[PDB]
């Protein structure tokens, strides 16, 4: 990564940052989770530490091909947005970036610093990251086991796990804020169980979760 | 975070502050010394890294998503009592921060850097950090499963375990210091076993907890 | 921490640090030694890491609220010697500090780092650490089941484990060094068995503890 | 390795850097992430680091000799190209380096450092890094068990499994981008089982692998 | 510690120094391989530093008083050659250290690192240490079970074993270098079981210790 | 060790290259990786370091005199070559160094990092590693348990293993590149089974190992 006296000096990636996301993927799998940590070991990363990451994931090919497909998508769509003009590359300046520059396949270091530097800065890193997190996003959509119309609390099911399981697989849901905010309205009420439905249709339509929770505590 | 030649100059979350806070959260659940610990790893830290932080939580989405609302309850009373003014940001300046810019939702690293950093300082991750304490005392108090009214030392329990148990449901009680201090004047030598409540209550009232400590070590 | 081009420089108290700690009381309870890996980890520490420090302790609610009076009695005899003035903060000068201001409560981060760094210098860390080590000494008192005039040495056991287990209990003694040279110039050869009582009797007052023991080795 | 003020530094190798290979070598084999983490750990790498990390290999001497004879041709064909002239080294110059200089054999640690920093600079480092990396991808070639050829979807199997299965072998498969596509084309919608795979022609030549894997879900 | 810009800067001990150390005594209580430990870990350690590995050592508390008594001594041989002179510590100067300064009993931190960084320097950490490692002698003299003078070869035993066994006993007595030559030079062949002290005596008074075992390898 | 601004500055032996080396003597013994593993973990090592690395082996003692009469040898050539002029000390200048200084052992800190970074610089460092390297082949070639005569394929064996084997003996042999070639041209093809030696014999002498080994990949 690159860390900023003023300026941004480069630096290799740690050993622990690469064992602790090898860990992370053999552990977890893909799980959102697994994208935070990603995001959180990559900050301010080039494209060659995070291809670095990438690669010394063992096993999971078949996301990692779905992961390669989504970013030779969105570097086609860069490429279709940014067209590069032929010509030479004048005395202290540097070439545009193509889609495949970004995704680090065809750059070095040396440019990969060069743009991540520059005022004003094309952060390659941070657009390789966002494509990157999008297919990972992806991922985690086709490996969710459970859909969220399906998170239905038990009988004696305690109301702080039934939350506890709907949260968890809303957030593998691949839908807008406004359409999580709508399930949140309706689906979380509507699928407790009756004792316990009761009460939080008493409470009101416009209750914050730690209401509703302290609410059905006792049931 | 962010460390101070003189100057502040920015860094990134190491991968074992991250290691250690979701082991903190694996192991220990929600409990003030999963507060302590968060604000340890996260001194001098940026709404990234604090953000960074809540998103590698795995599981506990109820209590995440508490977190949330009141995070959201603080930024709008920020934007409530700080009214964003319409105009074009002029040269040299940085412009006045939203509630969701605090929580990091809405505002770049480099945003955030400049606030701390400028002079006048605006402290947007000890801000973020106060709302993210809020929320979690919030959660410690309701998944606290005793009362400190319940607490009561058993016939042959040694004093000291007692007081062990005292001290630990109200450290996770939600009361101001004055009303703490009336539980410990009242209820620590009210709940007491009769043997060594009738010998404290020979001390007297203005005893220190190592003499009463020291008074039924016998009993 | 602070550690010292020249000056001294601000840094966020390390996650080692903190999982060396927390697994030092996890494991250790309370014990001399205990109190010296807290000076070795606190080495330079601000008011804000001592308190870090002692807020991640889990459990041993009993020995933190000792401790948390205690730090209230030497504040108050700190305000006591050093009475605050009332009046208005000249520029280019700082406030004198109160007991609560020593023990971080009631200062902030750049305060402690002022009275550390200015010269003259105000050690607020090495201030509130002595007390923090006075009441962890009381702790250490209180919790000591044996007292150093039980330590007697069995009919068949090794001089050697005799010596362990005598300065042992003699390091969590409350005692000044004369007291405790006093213990060891009479209970030491008092309250050995025999065989080797009469060998040591047979050396003189004036022995090392190096002579005592190869005295008594084949016995 | 050596790291980028603006300057190049040299810096030791780290010693969880040599664990972190040792131990990935002695649990992984010889596998496409093995050579992803080997190109990981040794960023910025010189000659001699890169020797490190493979004279530390315990066992696997095989491997480690074909790796040697790969790098003495790498090394005879750049002696081919590149011919040394005889004469003497001017002040303020450098010797033009041959194979076993880029090996690190021949060459001191002055020699390499001076050969990267310089300008223009020689990187001899990346240079004996892509020898490496080329014999390494012939021991993988060799220690591969399967071959594409073989790897079919069994009655029963789940897609996603097969398509595991198909990329891991794929990964370590010697050829190039081209034969991969084609691979890609033929080979994996060829060796589905009957009722994946009639689906997968009923959705048509062009689909990606998130809706070849969409599709077959079920099945 | 201190670590050399040029200049020398003060350092805090880090934390997995201290748990080396405390895992090194824990471990392998106390033999010659614990001394090199200490010195390894203790290069450029300050009398605070030192302090700070001995009193973190739990248990072993005949020992540790042993090395206290042994520091004592060796202070007062300090106070007896170098005797304080009465008077006013000059501007621009610093006092000459007591026996008990050295030991960081009786002096600061400061005070330390100014004894150290001064021109000419005051190595109090280098003499508070050399008695460390002379009391620490002491201890593993007393300590040692076996004497050089019982270690004999087995009659089935392999004389490299038996070499083991020589030079690690050998290693613990407390002899100057011409003693132990001695030792070498007689007890070795002299305890040598007869099939190949005879052969070693075929060999001649001055081979060395690699053509001995090479010598008795077969028998 | 010392680490190159542009000026080398002096720096103390990290934690856990002590550790890693313990715990690889203690693992390994002493086998060429554990050589590797030294000349790794002592990258610009001082001869402080190095004896800091050698004295910190516990047990095999054996191994380690005769490690100290091999450096007593080189540095006895040492002093024979390069005779000390008895003479004053310059202003300015330095002496130079002993077999004894090479050693560290009548040498310290000060004059081994002078004579380091001199220029000329004498690079006492390296040399007394070279020494120490030179008593460790001494070493692995003692304890090496197997000739390379000895290394046969077994009727069964697939011819992988047997190279693994042939080259783990080969490694560890005491001789020159050239003949290491011959027994490399000789021996490997002579000791197979004869129905792996008759194919090799078919391919030719001037086959590669990655040729013999596809080779007789079937057999
Ligand atoms: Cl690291
Ligand atoms: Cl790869
Ligand atoms: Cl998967
Ligand atoms: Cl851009
Ligand atoms: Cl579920
Ligand atoms: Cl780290
Ligand atoms: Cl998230
Ligand atoms: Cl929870
Ligand atoms: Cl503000
Ligand atoms: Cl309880
Ligand atoms: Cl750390
Ligand atoms: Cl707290
Ligand atoms: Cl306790
Ligand atoms: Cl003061
Ligand atoms: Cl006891
Ligand atoms: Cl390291
Ligand atoms: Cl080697
Ligand atoms: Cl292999
Ligand atoms: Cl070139
Ligand atoms: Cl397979
Ligand atoms: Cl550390
Ligand atoms: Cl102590
Ligand atoms: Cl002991
Ligand atoms: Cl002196
Ligand atoms: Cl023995
Ligand atoms: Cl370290
Ligand atoms: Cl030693
Ligand atoms: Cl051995
Ligand atoms: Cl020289
Ligand atoms: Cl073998």
Redesign the interface.
């Known amino acids: 990564?690159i860390?900023?006296?003023?300026?941004m000096?480069?630096?290799?990636?740690?050993?622990?940052?690469?064992?602790?996301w090898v860990k992370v993927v053999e552990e977890?799998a893909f799980?959102?989770?697994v994208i935070?940590?990603f995001?959180?070991?990559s900050?301010?990363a080039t494209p060659?530490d995070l291809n670095?990451m990438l690669?010394?994931?063992?096993?999971?090919?078949?996301a990692?091909?779905?992961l390669k497909?989504?970013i030779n998508e969105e570097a086609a769509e860069w490429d279709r947005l940014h067209p590069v003009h032929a010509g030479p590359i004048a005395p202290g300046q540097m070439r545009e970036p193509r889609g495949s520059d970004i995704a680090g396949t065809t750059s070095t270091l040396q440019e990969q610093?060069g743009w991540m530097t520059h005022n004003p800065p094309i952060p390659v890193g941070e657009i390789y990251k966002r494509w990157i997190i999008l297919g990972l996003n992806?991922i985690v959509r086709?490996y969710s086991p459970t859909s969220i119309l399906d998170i239905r609390q038990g009988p004696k099911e305690p109301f702080?796990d039934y939350?506890?399981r709907?949260?968890?697989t809303?957030?593998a849901e691949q839908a807008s804020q406004e359409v999580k905010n709508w399930m949140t309205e309706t689906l979380l009420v509507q699928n407790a169980n009756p004792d316990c439905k009761t009460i939080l249709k008493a409470l009101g339509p416009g209750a914050?979760?730690?209401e509703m929770?302290?609410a059905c505590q006792g049931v």
Chains 1, 2, 3, 4, 5, 6 share one sequence.
């Open positions: 990564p860390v900023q006296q003023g300026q000096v480069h630096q290799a990636i740690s050993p622990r940052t690469l064992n602790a977890k799980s959102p989770e935070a940590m995001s959180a070991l900050e301010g060659q670095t690669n010394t994931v063992g096993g999971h090919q078949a990692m091909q779905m497909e989504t610093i992806k086709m702080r939350v506890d709907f949260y968890k809303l957030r914050t979760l730690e929770m302290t």
